[PDB]
Amino acid sequence: SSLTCFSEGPAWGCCPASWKSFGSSCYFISSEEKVWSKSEQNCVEMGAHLVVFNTEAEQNFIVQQLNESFSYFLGLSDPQGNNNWQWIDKTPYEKNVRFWHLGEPNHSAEQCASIVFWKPTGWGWNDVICETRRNSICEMNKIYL
Amino acid sequence: SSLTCFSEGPAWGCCPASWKSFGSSCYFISSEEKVWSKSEQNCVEMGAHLVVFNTEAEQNFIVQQLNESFSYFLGLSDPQGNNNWQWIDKTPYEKNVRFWHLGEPNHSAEQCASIVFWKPTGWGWNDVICETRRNSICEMNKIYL
Ligand SMILES: CO[C@H]1O[C@H](CO)[C@@H](O)[C@H](O)[C@@H]1O
Ligand SMILES: CO[C@H]1O[C@H](CO)[C@@H](O)[C@H](O)[C@@H]1O
Ligand SMILES: [Ca+2]
Ligand SMILES: [Ca+2]
Ligand SMILES: [Ca+2]
Ligand SMILES: [Ca+2]
Ligand code: NA
Ligand code: NA
Incomplete structure (x- = not known):
C-alpha cells in the first residue's frame, strides 16, 4: 500500500512504488515469461495494459x-x-510512430510485436509468434493528488 | 522531489522521501551537531519543529x-x-509522559532535554546545557492527499 509522488508545477503525480515513472504514465517491467495473451492478462490484473509507444x-x-x-x-x-x-x-x-527494425515485420504467422536489441541498430520492433514465451512491459495512467 | 504515501483505509498520508513515518507524523534524524537553538531553526527551515513525545x-x-x-x-x-x-x-x-532517566533531571543550569542511551536502563531523557552541540530529531504533521 505505497505510492511514490513527484512534484508538479494538481500538485502531485504518483505511481506505485515498485513501478517506473515518466511523462503522464507509470510502467512495470516483468521478468517472468508468458505467451502474449497471458502477458496481457498479467498487466490487466494490475489495472494496466501492454505498453503503447506514442x-x-x-x-x-x-x-x-x-x-x-x-x-x-x-x-x-x-x-x-x-x-x-x-x-x-x-x-x-x-498516424503514430512505427519503430520497426530493418527488414521487419516479415512473416504473416508472426502476429505479435516485441521490442528487442540487435546490433548494430540497437532496440527496435520485431514481429514474432504470439505463443512463444517472453517478457512484457505494462503502462497505466499516473495517479494525481 | 519526492513523497512516499501509504493507504489510509482522505485516502493517502505521505511524508518526504528521506524522512520516516509513524502515526500521524513524519520524522527526520539529523546527524549534524548544533546547539539547541540552531537545531530548532534547522527543523523550522524544513517546516518542522524539534520532536514532542506524546x-x-x-x-x-x-x-x-x-x-x-x-x-x-x-x-x-x-x-x-x-x-x-x-x-x-x-x-x-x-498531563503527559516523562521518560526521564533515573536521577534526572538534576541541574537548574542544564535547561535543555535530550534522549540518550545508558546501560542498564537504555534510552531515556537527560537535561543538559543548551549551548552544547548534539544531534536532533524533527517532527511534522503528515501531508494528506
Ligand atoms: C533471427 O531473427 C529472425 O528469426 C526470428 C524468428 O523468431 C524472426 O521473427 C525475426 O524476424 C528474424 O527473421
Ligand atoms: C553523562 O551524564 C552526566 O553528565 C551530564 C552533563 O551533561 C549530566 O547532564 C547528567 O545529569 C549526568 O550527571
Ligand atoms: Ca504510452
Ligand atoms: Ca519477424
Ligand atoms: Ca509527537
Ligand atoms: Ca542532567
Ligand atoms: Na507478422
Ligand atoms: Na534542568
Missing part, C-alpha cells in the same frame, strides 16, 4: 530499464495475419 | 532509528531555570 522520447526512456539479452512483448498485434497492426488501446497505427 | 509507542519507534553512541535534542526546555519544563508546541508537560 513518441520516440517514451521508447528511449523504456529501453534503459530493459535487459538487452531479452525481448519484450508490446501492445501491438495483427490478429488476422494481414498486416492490419492494431494497438491494444485503439490508438491509430498509421 | 506516548511511549512513539518513543519505541524513534530510538530504533537512532545510534546508541549519540544523544539527541528534544523539543523540551526550561527557559527560566526553575523546573517549569515546556514543550515546543505548548502541549502540557504534566
Whole structure:
C-alpha cells in the first residue's frame, strides 16, 4: 500500500512504488515469461495494459530499464495475419510512430510485436509468434493528488 | 522531489522521501551537531519543529532509528531555570509522559532535554546545557492527499 509522488508545477503525480515513472504514465517491467495473451492478462490484473509507444522520447526512456539479452512483448498485434497492426488501446497505427527494425515485420504467422536489441541498430520492433514465451512491459495512467 | 504515501483505509498520508513515518507524523534524524537553538531553526527551515513525545509507542519507534553512541535534542526546555519544563508546541508537560532517566533531571543550569542511551536502563531523557552541540530529531504533521 505505497505510492511514490513527484512534484508538479494538481500538485502531485504518483505511481506505485515498485513501478517506473515518466511523462503522464507509470510502467512495470516483468521478468517472468508468458505467451502474449497471458502477458496481457498479467498487466490487466494490475489495472494496466501492454505498453503503447506514442513518441520516440517514451521508447528511449523504456529501453534503459530493459535487459538487452531479452525481448519484450508490446501492445501491438495483427490478429488476422494481414498486416492490419492494431494497438491494444485503439490508438491509430498509421498516424503514430512505427519503430520497426530493418527488414521487419516479415512473416504473416508472426502476429505479435516485441521490442528487442540487435546490433548494430540497437532496440527496435520485431514481429514474432504470439505463443512463444517472453517478457512484457505494462503502462497505466499516473495517479494525481 | 519526492513523497512516499501509504493507504489510509482522505485516502493517502505521505511524508518526504528521506524522512520516516509513524502515526500521524513524519520524522527526520539529523546527524549534524548544533546547539539547541540552531537545531530548532534547522527543523523550522524544513517546516518542522524539534520532536514532542506524546506516548511511549512513539518513543519505541524513534530510538530504533537512532545510534546508541549519540544523544539527541528534544523539543523540551526550561527557559527560566526553575523546573517549569515546556514543550515546543505548548502541549502540557504534566498531563503527559516523562521518560526521564533515573536521577534526572538534576541541574537548574542544564535547561535543555535530550534522549540518550545508558546501560542498564537504555534510552531515556537527560537535561543538559543548551549551548552544547548534539544531534536532533524533527517532527511534522503528515501531508494528506
Ligand atoms: C533471427 O531473427 C529472425 O528469426 C526470428 C524468428 O523468431 C524472426 O521473427 C525475426 O524476424 C528474424 O527473421
Ligand atoms: C553523562 O551524564 C552526566 O553528565 C551530564 C552533563 O551533561 C549530566 O547532564 C547528567 O545529569 C549526568 O550527571
Ligand atoms: Ca504510452
Ligand atoms: Ca519477424
Ligand atoms: Ca509527537
Ligand atoms: Ca542532567
Ligand atoms: Na507478422
Ligand atoms: Na534542568
